[PDB]
Design a protein around this nucleic acid. Structure first.
Ligand SMILES: Nc1nc2c(ncn2[C@@H]2O[C@H](COP(=O)(O)O)[C@@H](O)[C@H]2OP(=O)(O)OC[C@H]2O[C@@H](n3cnc4c(N)ncnc43)[C@H](O)[C@@H]2O)c(=O)[nH]1
Ligand SMILES: [Zn+2]
Length: 354
DNA sequence: AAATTGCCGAAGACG
DNA sequence: CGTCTTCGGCAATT
């Protein structure tokens, strides 16, 4: 049954080819515009991120994430309260001085200019049906809607790149020592970290100056390098069901969200985060054998339910940041999701039949 | 020093 | 299952 759902979720090559060709054209154009000329974002470089580029996109290739990363030397971080994930940014005749709010580099100001430039360039595209989606408060993304004629959304994510050591809130995150190992962890943490203009929500409003930590790069590496054995899912190695298990979990949540508005606060990142913990908990490739797909999915569900019940889902990189805190998601919303998942679980997943 | 190209892994296609 | 294919990521090289 699960194998047949996976067949259904699997992307078609023809769909991939048609989508990618258009998406790549638009992105390439936006990138060229940023880099030329007297622009504040002149040095941005492209990094493709998220589900599609992690090969865990399901159903249709209609969502693409891409970061435009900007190297900003000598920045100093001040943690926004005790959130671990959100920060104010300061510097130790720059183009970025336009975005300064005091000595603080404002996320809103920088994103708004970034967004303004994108809209200008999108207006000049004549051969492709593309529009800029209406702004979402808090969101770090400038979202494009493309009609290929099929609907495709492209999230362009502005990001600051810092080459320094990672903020201490991440010191006990990335607990992959018994799984991917110490050399991998050390090497990953020697890579840069990123800040995206996602504002912290403080009560009824957003703190417009705040930035948010990003490890979209690391997550991408982990998805592509996910086994304890170096040959996991390689041509001279054994196939595992780690990614398949993630697709099924993503699908379950997506179907549930499609018919229950009370689940708007839940997202695929919660699912991704839960399975990262699961991969830490069950490190052996043998406990992710394709023959044991059914029990792997069940283990994930039980773990997820327990996170729901205890209102605790630690960010994989920032362990003191609880994705399932009462502050972020209401108790009733979690209890609601708990009931739905339990139902689908005990009933052989009727919602998988659309 | 921006744009081209080579290589090959991941995974879809179909036997 | 194997073999072929395309897309993505990389960085040498001009
Ligand atoms: N990547 C990511 N996404 C996060 C997130 N916290 C919540 N979410 C949400 O999950 C979904 C992820 O999409 P995916 O393509 O990976 O399957 C989205 O619904 C995302 O919602 P969002 O409102 O927060 O973000 C919108 C837009 O911004 C990107 N984004 C959010 N946050 C980041 C970070 N930290 N780095 C890079 N990009 C980020 C989202 O991908 C989406 O494109 C989380 O921490 N990370
Ligand atoms: Zn594997």
């Amino acid at each position: 049954k699960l194998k047949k759902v996976l067949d259904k979720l699997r992307l078609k090559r023809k769909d991939i080819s048609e989508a990618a060709e258009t998406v790549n054209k638009v992105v390439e154009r936006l990138l060229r515009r940023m880099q030329k000329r007297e622009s504040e974002f002149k040095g941005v470089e492209q990094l493709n991120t998220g589900s599609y580029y992690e090969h865990v996109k399901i159903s249709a290739p209609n969502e693409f994430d891409v970061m435009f990363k900007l190297e900003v030397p000598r920045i100093e971080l001040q943690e926004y309260y005790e959130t671990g994930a959100f920060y104010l940014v300061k510097f130790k005749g720059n183009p970025l001085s336009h975005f300064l709010e005091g000595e603080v580099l404002s996320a809103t100001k920088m994103l708004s200019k970034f967004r303004k430039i994108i809209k200008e360039e999108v207006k000049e595209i004549k051969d492709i049906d593309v529009s800029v989606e209406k702004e979402k408060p808090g969101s770090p993304a400038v979202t494009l809607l493309i009609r290929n004629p099929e609907e495709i959304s492209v999230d362009i994510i502005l990001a600051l790149e810092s080459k320094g050591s990672w903020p201490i809130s991440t010191k006990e995150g990335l607990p992959i020592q018994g799984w991917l190992g110490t050399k991998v962890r050390t090497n990953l943490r020697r890579e840069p970290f990123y800040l995206v203009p996602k504002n912290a929500k403080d009560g009824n409003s957003f703190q417009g100056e705040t930035w948010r930590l990003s490890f979209s790069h690391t997550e991408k590496y982990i998805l592509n390098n996910h086994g304890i054995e170096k040959t996991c899912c390689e041509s001279s190695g054994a196939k595992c069901c780690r990614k398949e298990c993630l697709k099924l979990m993503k699908y379950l949540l997506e179907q549930l969200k499609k018919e229950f508005q009370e689940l708007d606060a839940f997202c695929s990142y919660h699912v991704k985060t839960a399975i990262f913990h699961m991969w830490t908990q069950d490190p052996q490739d043998s406990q992710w054998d394709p023959r044991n797909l059914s029990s792997c999915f069940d283990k994930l569900l039980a773990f997820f339910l327990e996170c729901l019940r205890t209102e605790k889902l630690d960010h994989y990189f920032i362990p003191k940041f609880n994705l399932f805190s009462q502050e972020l998601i209401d108790r009733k919303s979690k209890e609601f999701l708990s009931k739905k998942i339990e139902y689908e679980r005990n009933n052989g997943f009727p919602i998988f039949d659309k």
